[model samples]
Target: SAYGSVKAYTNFDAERDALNIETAIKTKGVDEVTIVNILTNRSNEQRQDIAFAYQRRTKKELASALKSALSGHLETVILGLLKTPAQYDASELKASMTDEDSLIEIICSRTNQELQEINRVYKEMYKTDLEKDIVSDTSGDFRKLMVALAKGRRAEDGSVIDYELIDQDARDLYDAGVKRKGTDVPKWISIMTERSVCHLQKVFERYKSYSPYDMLESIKKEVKGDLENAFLNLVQCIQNKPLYFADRLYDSMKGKGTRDKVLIRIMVSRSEVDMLKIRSEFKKKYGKSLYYYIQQDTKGDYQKALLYLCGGDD
Candidate 1:
């Protein structure tokens, strides 16, 4: 979307303005709004060239001029885009789940699967688990719920669970996890750490078809063999970076127990990294937009983190 808006800006070729490079924004009324948004919302690298061009053309600073023209919400977001990548990352993280007004608190209140997703991505992007941050940042029911959801550690049982194709999977897990030297690790990590929850649902379908088992169950059974657990953790979280999170909410109300803590932990955490691909997988597999589903499931700071991490705006 940001790219599209930026495209509209660059392609604005008025009959009178080729030599001096007058912006479409100056010539085309509110059309400039699209360019402004793109420049303000795109990732750090995407902004540099346009920013330089604007400054050179106008002689007045573009971002500063924008600051004067815009106010409140628009200005704040534009300011965020202008920031350095590292600064943007830190700020975006804070706005989404880390800040007091986070959307994650809601999701966390709803499900464990979501928390599991967050835990994986937080580790991937920040090199640490989100649960650890919540442990330090929150207290009481909130903290308890978040921690529980995050630690969705299933049993490493060796007993052959009769999910059909169990032997094939066990062998696959062994090969993917051990014999192959972690080749599958990156793929698994992408699935678990960033993709939305709905992606996991499709995977659940394949898992069900092949083994007549839930996806999580398969991982639990297969993870018993050495490094299998390590890889399993990646597969689990990346399967549904966000939408599986919504399921976690539904399950909280109807399932055997409330995994609210996990929901909070996951939703709060995995809002960065390769979430765009994860969302795409969830859509392809489940035939739904993880973004649309999330609006109903989360709010405030947590929602901000989730969207930004998805990388669509970036």
Candidate 2:
């Protein structure tokens, strides 16, 4: 599993942190600075502990107070931080109904354990089956693939990759999508969803040999619409996760209005895991630092938290 970069605080004092948070929230018009200072520096677990202690002492939800005090992207990020990892993911999964790409990004990229956890949390939080919602909200082959991925059935064995199977899968992917009239969507989906990551990497390697271009290039050339984007995202995620995230962050922040949800999701989720590498990839690929753009585009505590999670520029 890809790990988080944000570690829990060593000298964590949950009660004191809760007190500080209470004071920050209880103050006239709320001290946004104090809120950001306490919350941004702590790990998600530490923050959750602080929230529990705050509620224990005050008999009021710290999350509610923070929500009341903040607005815009800051509020979204802060409240998002308040949820358990599962809870946060469940919420994001539901919120992603209209945004299928985000939904696929999360469900496809997660480890089997992570996906299972998401499924459990989604059912618990939403009071509905994750698979049910996926089927209802999405349509066609894309929905089929989404449901399969949501089932958390990816093979996790550390067995050696079979070279012959890799070649066959590669040929199948090429023949189905590129060499044929219309795509063999089921074959592409099956190979992508069923195969182990190690196996998929080797298969993609073989795929490159089979086609004039790489798997991603062939997919772009052969497929179209949301399904095309979904496959591309899955391939990118498999190929280089950090770089995939860097591209996602860029997509969220570039051009027009910021996709604040995507920005917050990536920053908060990856903060404890691989955010530094994501930052490095961002700089290497974009020529400008992520910090520069977040500072340039976002405002207030939202920007502050993102920059904090982002750490120093590359």
Candidate 3:
């Protein structure tokens, strides 16, 4: 089962939050703490009501007011929070983190259950089918691979592995990969894309000892370009998805002038989904808690908003 940091705020009231926000914005110096506290504490549903109620009372959209009232990273975090998760994904899917690198990463990593919803919003927003844009946006084997995943039809097997088929797949990849001159790309694609996540986990585990080289090494040697990256991401997500995002999360926050946009995107999208898992993975790998990093890397309401989304510490 999946658990996330941001849950629906119990005892929530949109009218009160809206009034508090209106009062905050109307203040002499713009009391940011009040604004931040209210905005970050409530659930998305509650926040949506706050926005509408703010509109009803003030004749202005809260997101619009936030745009003018706040500056820099604070506004970015707040604006992103204003959007529902599906909109955030579709919105993010559409370029600060909007580039194709993010596009491929998001499409490849999200499960069919999640992707099905993302595709709906993506289709409506782009005024085109998600798969259609994907087809036009890319080409060749990678195109086929991404479109297949984007169709959101992966065999959803979570628990329980198939013992017999595991051995067959492990050997199949070896035969299709290093054992041949040209890779059996078709065979690898079908198995990699179609297999259950739990099943694939073991197959790759067995293949590591079965083959002289691991799947990553095999992939590096055999495939090149986007197709290579596409498979690499699939393998990462298959093995430990939260850990994959944990790595990416650390990357976005580390070093000078790191990607603030990607940081916001990851937190908002995963906050209500698997961020609790993501938080644990981050601490296990990185040695410091996710909240500490966010605290160190960002300042003011931006940091507060992130902590609220991160939801906890080690």
Using lDDT as the measure, which candidate wins? 2
Worst 10 residues of 1 by lDDT: 1-10
Residues 1-314, candidate 2: write the lDDT tens digits.
14455667788999999988888887998888888877878888899899899999999988888777888888888888788777888888999985877987777666788778888988988899999998899998789888888888877667766778889999999999888888889999999999887789888988988789899899899888988888998998888888999999999988877988889998887787688888888899999998898888798777887887776674
lDDT of each: 0.44, 0.84, 0.82
Task: Quote the positional error of residue 21 for candidate 2 in Å.
Answer: 0.6
Clashing pairs in 2: 3-273, 4-272, 4-273, 5-272, 5-273, 6-272
lDDT of 2 at 313: 76
Sorted on TM-score, best first, the list reads 2, 3, 1
Instruction: Please give the range of 10 consecutive residues that has the lowest summed lDDT in model 3.
Output: 92-101
TM-score of each: 0.35, 0.95, 0.90
What C-alpha lDDT, on a 0 to 100 scale, does residue 144 get in candidate 2?
85
Model 1 per-residue lDDT tens digits across residues 195-237: 2344443444554554544556655554444234333333444
Best TM-score among the predictions, by candidate number = 2
Query: Candidate 3: lDDT of 216?
Result: 83
Off by over 4 Å in 1: 1-30, 33-43, 56-61, 71-78, 96-136, 139-236, 242-276, 285-314
TM-score of 1: 0.35
Backbone clashes for every candidate come to 34, 6, 1
